[PDB]
Amino acid sequence: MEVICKHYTPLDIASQAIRTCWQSFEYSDDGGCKDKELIHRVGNIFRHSSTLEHLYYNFEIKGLSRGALQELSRHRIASLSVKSSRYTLRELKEVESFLPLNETNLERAKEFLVFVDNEKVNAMSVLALENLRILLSEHNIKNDLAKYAMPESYKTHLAYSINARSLQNFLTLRSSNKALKEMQDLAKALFDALPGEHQYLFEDCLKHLEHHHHH
Amino acid sequence: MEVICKHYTPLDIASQAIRTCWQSFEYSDDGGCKDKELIHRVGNIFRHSSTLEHLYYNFEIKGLSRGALQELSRHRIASLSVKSSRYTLRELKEVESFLPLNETNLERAKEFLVFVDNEKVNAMSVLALENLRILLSEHNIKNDLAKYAMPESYKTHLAYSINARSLQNFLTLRSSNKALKEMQDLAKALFDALPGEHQYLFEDCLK
Amino acid sequence: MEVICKHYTPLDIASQAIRTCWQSFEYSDDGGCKDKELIHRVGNIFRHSSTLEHLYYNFEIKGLSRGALQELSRHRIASLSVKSSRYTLRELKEVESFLPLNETNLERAKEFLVFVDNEKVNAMSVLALENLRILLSEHNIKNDLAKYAMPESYKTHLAYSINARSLQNFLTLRSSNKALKEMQDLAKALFDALPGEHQYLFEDCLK
Amino acid sequence: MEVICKHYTPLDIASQAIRTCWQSFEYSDDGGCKDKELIHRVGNIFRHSSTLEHLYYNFEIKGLSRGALQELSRHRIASLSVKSSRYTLRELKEVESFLPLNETNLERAKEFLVFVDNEKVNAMSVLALENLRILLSEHNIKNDLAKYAMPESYKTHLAYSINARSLQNFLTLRSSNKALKEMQDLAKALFDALPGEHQYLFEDCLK
Numbered sequence: 001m002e003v004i005c006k007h008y009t010p011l012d013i014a015s016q017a018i019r020t021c022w023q024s025f026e027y028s029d030d031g032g033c034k035d036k037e038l039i040h041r042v043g044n045i046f047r048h049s050s051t052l053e054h055l056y057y058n059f060e061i062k063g064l065s066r067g068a069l070q071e072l073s074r075h076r077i078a079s080l081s082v083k084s085s086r087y088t089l090r091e092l093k094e095v096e097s098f099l100p101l102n103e104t105n106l107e108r109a110k111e112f113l114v115f116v117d118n119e120k121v122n123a124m125s126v127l128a129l130e131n132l133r134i135l136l137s138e139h140n141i142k143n144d145l146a147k148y149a150m151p152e153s154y155k156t157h158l159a160y161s162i163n164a165r166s167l168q169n170f171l172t173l174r175s176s177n178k179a180l181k182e183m184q185d186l187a188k189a190l191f192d193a194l195p196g197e198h199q200y201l202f203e204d205c206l207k208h209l210e211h212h213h214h215h
Numbered sequence: 216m217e218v219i220c221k222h223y224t225p226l227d228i229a230s231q232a233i234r235t236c237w238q239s240f241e242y243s244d245d246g247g248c249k250d251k252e253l254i255h256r257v258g259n260i261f262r263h264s265s266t267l268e269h270l271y272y273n274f275e276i277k278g279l280s281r282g283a284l285q286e287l288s289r290h291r292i293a294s295l296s297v298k299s300s301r302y303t304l305r306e307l308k309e310v311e312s313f314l315p316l317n318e319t320n321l322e323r324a325k326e327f328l329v330f331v332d333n334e335k336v337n338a339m340s341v342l343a344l345e346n347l348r349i350l351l352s353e354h355n356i357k358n359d360l361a362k363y364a365m366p367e368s369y370k371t372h373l374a375y376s377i378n379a380r381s382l383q384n385f386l387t388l389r390s391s392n393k394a395l396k397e398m399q400d401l402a403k404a405l406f407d408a409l410p411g412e413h414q415y416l417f418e419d420c421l422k
Numbered sequence: 423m424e425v426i427c428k429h430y431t432p433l434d435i436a437s438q439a440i441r442t443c444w445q446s447f448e449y450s451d452d453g454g455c456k457d458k459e460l461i462h463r464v465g466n467i468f469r470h471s472s473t474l475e476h477l478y479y480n481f482e483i484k485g486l487s488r489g490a491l492q493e494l495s496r497h498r499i500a501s502l503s504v505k506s507s508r509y510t511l512r513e514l515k516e517v518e519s520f521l522p523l524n525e526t527n528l529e530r531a532k533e534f535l536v537f538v539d540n541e542k543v544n545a546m547s548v549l550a551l552e553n554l555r556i557l558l559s560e561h562n563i564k565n566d567l568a569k570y571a572m573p574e575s576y577k578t579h580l581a582y583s584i585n586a587r588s589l590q591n592f593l594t595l596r597s598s599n600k601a602l603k604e605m606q607d608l609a610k611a612l613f614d615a616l617p618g619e620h621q622y623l624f625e626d627c628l629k
Numbered sequence: 630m631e632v633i634c635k636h637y638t639p640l641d642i643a644s645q646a647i648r649t650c651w652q653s654f655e656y657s658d659d660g661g662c663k664d665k666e667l668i669h670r671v672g673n674i675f676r677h678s679s680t681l682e683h684l685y686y687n688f689e690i691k692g693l694s695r696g697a698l699q700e701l702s703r704h705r706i707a708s709l710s711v712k713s714s715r716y717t718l719r720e721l722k723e724v725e726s727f728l729p730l731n732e733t734n735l736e737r738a739k740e741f742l743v744f745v746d747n748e749k750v751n752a753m754s755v756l757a758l759e760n761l762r763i764l765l766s767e768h769n770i771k772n773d774l775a776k777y778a779m780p781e782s783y784k785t786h787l788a789y790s791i792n793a794r795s796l797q798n799f800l801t802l803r804s805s806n807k808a809l810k811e812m813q814d815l816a817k818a819l820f821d822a823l824p825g826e827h828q829y830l831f832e833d834c835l836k
């Protein structure tokens with residue numbers, strides 16, 4: 001799994017919005033430590049958390065399992081353009097069988113499958129991958145029908161955009177130890193992809209200081 | 216699949232809302248044909264389609280594939296509580312093998328899988344189902360790990376709540392022949408599950 | 423201000439929804455006290471908050487000031503149909519002057535204005551109300567223009583619908599002492615209008 | 630009224646998003662003629678219009694009326710941070726009267742009021758402004774109470790963010806001849822503040 005932050009809204013956009021409520025520009029730093037500190041003090045007060053919505057982040061996500069896509073898509077206050085299995089499963093036509101399950105076929109399978117910490121499941125996923133490319137390549141069955149045999153370990157790719165407020169929500173919900181392992185990884189990857197200057201607005205989301213049982 | 220409308224907002228909620236913008240209550244016929252056509256007429260003037268949002272429908276959907284869930288979840292202006300593979304895959308631990316593919320095992324497999332119009336794909340789905348069961352039952356692997364080998368054709372179950380405005384959007388987009396067959400079927404099942412008196416509001420959005 | 427709950431989703435709906443997640447129906451008592459206990463329990467766990475969304479409330483709000491409407495419409499996850507000033511200001515076309523500010527007039531003025539806890543501002547509102555009446559009655563000036571001289575204490579009427587999850591968020595924010603006094607009343611009024619058994623889902627929001 | 634686009638998402642963020650769906654990266658020309666044509670073509674196909682949501686526009690709106698704020702706040706798929714009358718009304722505590730009304734005092738009133746195409750209604754606004762000032766100055770009454778005598782023509786200031794998809798919707802709904810004049814102006818203004826490169830994505834929405 002690889003996550004990249006393709007674009008982000010400059011920090012002061014948020015400080016400029018906050019001061020607009022109280023008309024306290026006279027105390028503006030134009031992006032100085034005072035303004036930055038303001039976004040964190042006001043932006044984190046629930047009644048005024050909406051101020052962080054002005055901050056947007058354009059990410060790219062590679063290698064996420066479709067099973068994890070099921071969960072990512074539930075965060076409805078965000079935008080995504082996802083690789084369609086309906087429009088792209090043909091990618092398995094000109095591909096060699098993944099069986100027998102030898103050392104080099106397993107590695108080849110990783111291009112299309114997300115492996116987890118259990119050799120047997122990974123094996124089964126590859127068996128599902130093989131049967132899938134058999135339907136698509138050897139019997140030219142259409143994507144719309146063949147997709148039904150595809151394992152959720154199958155890899156997806158997506159462009160993902162989300163504002164700061166919704167992102168704190170995502171990180172709080174997914175960095176939690178109650179979330180699927182892969183999703184916890186997505187959460188961290190997202191945070192890490194974030195520009196150093198903005199991370200202070202999301203750090204406490206990985207700490208769970210209000211509900212510590214999540215770590 | 217199976218869809219049932221467990222509850223819906225009475226039509227007069229929307230006609231009363233509409234008449235509030237203009238305070239045109241004197242024209243109300245108490246939830247009669249006038250108020251009914253008012254909902255459809257004003258509800259279709261784009262600048263006032265929000266008025267339809269007051270209408271809410273609570274559905275129960277049984278038999279939808281995970282692959283179809285993947286698409287349904289993309290309609291954001293809606294609420295849903297879905298059966299979790301992370302919390303319910305232990306349902307395969309003590310079940311009988313799905314192989315061979317005799318009639319009783321295929322019937323049992325249909326309780327867990329959606330079959331499409333291709334005998335080979337379904338055979339494959341049943342094979343993926345069996346491996347999933349084997350991972351869960353004998354190798355006793357935990358849900359968070361085994362769910363990765365689960366085939367998207369696995370059946371899901373969920374409660375689905377959406378308002379009239381978001382529903383028209385769904386029916387329009389998913390009844391299109393551009394949509395996945397299962398989704399087209401979903402749109403139709405959603406429509407057929409709607410109380411008769413309300414269908415006139417969504418009829419124009421179907422097909 | 424007056425608030426009325428015209429319709430609401432039955433409780434067992436969120437009850438049936440939560441159980442769909444774990445497929446724990448055998449434990450259900452058909453909306454009983456055990457299922458009712460469930461809604462509040464799981465409903466308060468943040469990762470399952472979404473289960474409260476299946477519950478929808480259809481309210482009618484009378485007498486709210488436009489100044490408060492300014493704040494209420496900022497809650498984006500709700501639906502509303504509001505009396506339009508652009509479309510209904512002629513309601514003043516045929517009304518007798520509100521001056522002098524005697525007591526019988528201060529009373530009539532209340533039919534169109536929200537009075538607060540201060541005689542002087544209320545007086546200014548009537549004067550503003552009177553000047554608005556003049557623009558509309560004597561000079562017959564269009565609504566789109568005359569509306570600019572309307573005091574924010576002018577009353578509005580609206581159909582308001584919102585789900586449990588968003589309502590909790592509302593009651594919590596607007597019942598705070600940090601909230602404009604009128605909004606605090608609105609929160610209390612929405613809570614009081616709720617059917618008996620639904621009120622436990624929102625009780626703590628007022629603390 | 631003044632509008633400034635403080636920041637925006639580069640176009641290829643959208644073309645990269647679209648291409649991700651079909652994995653058609655090979656035909657990309659890195660935000661060139663091809664990718665631009667792609668946004669306009671795919672981005673306007675309803676089933677794929679969500680691809681435009683990736684473009685975000687950060688604006689600044691100066692001198693908009695509260696009457697207009699009332700309608701602007703109804704577009705819930707957008708973000709806004711608005712000047713608060715509850716926190717900033719004391720700005721009238723040190724201003725001289727606007728009475729008697731005269732070329733000089735009217736001019737001064739424009740600093741706090743939005744004027745319209747009707748001198749009588751503008752005059753009535755200043756009179757409303759004078760009373761609001763009095764409540765705040767002469768009697769030092771709290772903003773929460775005084776604000777009730779404020780005319781909807783009072784000026785506001787806010788930071789406004791919204792994505793391409795929601796913006797097309799807004800421009801279509803507000804540039805319309807059915808919308809209040811000021812909103813038509815805000816629509817035109819927002820569109821003009823956009824960078825030329827992005828205007829071809831909104832031109833058909835406007836007029």
Ligand SMILES: Cc1cc2nc3c(=O)[nH]c(=O)nc-3n(C[C@H](O)[C@H](O)[C@H](O)COP(=O)(O)OP(=O)(O)OC[C@H]3O[C@@H](n4cnc5c(N)ncnc54)[C@H](O)[C@@H]3O)c2cc1C
Nearest residue numbers: 074075076077178179295296297299443469472475587588
């Ligand atoms: C550990 C874990 C376990 C889960 N288990 C299940 C499960 O078993 N079954 C299941 O179906 N889902 C499950 N989910 C999905 C989860 O319930 C939803 O993703 C979540 O409820 C959406 O809420 P959100 O806050 O993430 O909203 P987002 O959509 O990510 O963000 C929107 C925010 O806006 C508000 N909002 C948005 N839409 C609405 C609305 N329609 N009504 C009211 N407020 C709204 C909310 O306050 C929300 O926080 C689980 C998630 C986690 C992290």
Ligand SMILES: Cc1cc2nc3c(=O)[nH]c(=O)nc-3n(C[C@H](O)[C@H](O)[C@H](O)COP(=O)(O)OP(=O)(O)OC[C@H]3O[C@@H](n4cnc5c(N)ncnc54)[C@H](O)[C@@H]3O)c2cc1C
Nearest residue numbers: 080081082084289290291292388393650676679682794795
């Ligand atoms: C035939 C078909 C093919 C598809 N192919 C792909 C594909 O290849 N890749 C892919 O990633 N997706 C694909 N999708 C997903 C689809 O693009 C999204 O589900 C859809 O765009 C979300 O828009 P909606 O109108 O369904 O919104 P819903 O979420 O169902 O409803 C919300 C409505 O509110 C508005 N709205 C909601 N959220 C926002 C927001 N964040 N910004 C602005 N306005 C908003 C919109 O006007 C929208 O119509 C496909 C869908 C269909 C029907």
Ligand SMILES: Cc1cc2nc3c(=O)[nH]c(=O)nc-3n(C[C@H](O)[C@H](O)[C@H](O)COP(=O)(O)OP(=O)(O)OC[C@H]3O[C@@H](n4cnc5c(N)ncnc54)[C@H](O)[C@@H]3O)c2cc1C
Nearest residue numbers: 021050053165166496497498499595600601709710711713
């Ligand atoms: C005491 C008080 C003081 C206030 N002062 C000001 C002020 O000075 N200036 C001002 O402009 N406003 C002010 N407001 C308005 C307030 O900021 C908004 O009403 C509020 O931000 C809307 O947020 P919400 O959580 O109530 O969302 P709702 O719109 O009521 O509900 C939606 C929920 O979904 C989520 N959500 C919705 N939309 C988005 C989005 N676009 N991005 C991310 N998450 C989203 C949120 O988590 C939210 O809780 C004040 C409100 C109060 C109660």
Ligand SMILES: Cc1cc2nc3c(=O)[nH]c(=O)nc-3n(C[C@H](O)[C@H](O)[C@H](O)COP(=O)(O)OP(=O)(O)OC[C@H]3O[C@@H](n4cnc5c(N)ncnc54)[C@H](O)[C@@H]3O)c2cc1C
Nearest residue numbers: 236262265268380381503504506703704705706802807808
């Ligand atoms: C000329 C004109 C006249 C008007 N007259 C009145 C009037 O008399 N009374 C009155 O009360 N209002 C009136 N309005 C307000 C208007 O009806 C609302 O602002 C509007 O309906 C909100 O819809 P939207 O498309 O602007 O949504 P936005 O909130 O701007 O954008 C969100 C988009 O997402 C979708 N969406 C968002 N929320 C929901 C939801 N809860 N359910 C379903 N889909 C959703 C929609 O497709 C919508 O287009 C008027 C507006 C105009 C332009």
Ligand SMILES: O=c1ccn([C@H]2C[C@H](O)[C@@H](COP(=O)(O)O)O2)c(=O)[nH]1
Nearest residue numbers: 070071074179180297299300301302
């Ligand atoms: O950690 C979780 C568990 C469930 N879900 C939601 C989204 C899917 O629609 C459904 C998936 O359930 P699982 O297959 O992840 O168990 O419920 C999540 O978003 N995150």
Ligand SMILES: O=c1ccn([C@H]2C[C@H](O)[C@@H](COP(=O)(O)O)O2)c(=O)[nH]1
Nearest residue numbers: 082083084085086087285286289395
């Ligand atoms: O008809 C479609 C095609 C794609 N998608 C969206 C939602 C999923 O996140 C992803 C699924 O692509 P498919 O697996 O359906 O091809 O894109 C749909 O909703 N409907």
Ligand SMILES: O=c1ccn([C@H]2C[C@H](O)[C@@H](COP(=O)(O)O)O2)c(=O)[nH]1
Nearest residue numbers: 492493496602711712713714715716
């Ligand atoms: O308690 C408050 C204070 C401000 N606002 C938002 C919504 C309006 O757009 C604007 C109103 O500022 P006031 O007129 O309430 O001061 O900011 C609220 O919603 N609630």
Ligand SMILES: O=c1ccn([C@H]2C[C@H](O)[C@@H](COP(=O)(O)O)O2)c(=O)[nH]1
Nearest residue numbers: 504505506507508509699700703809
């Ligand atoms: O052109 C209009 C007419 C009405 N409204 C909505 C939003 C406000 O809540 C209420 C305002 O009615 P007017 O004051 O604009 O007449 O209805 C608009 O957004 N735009």
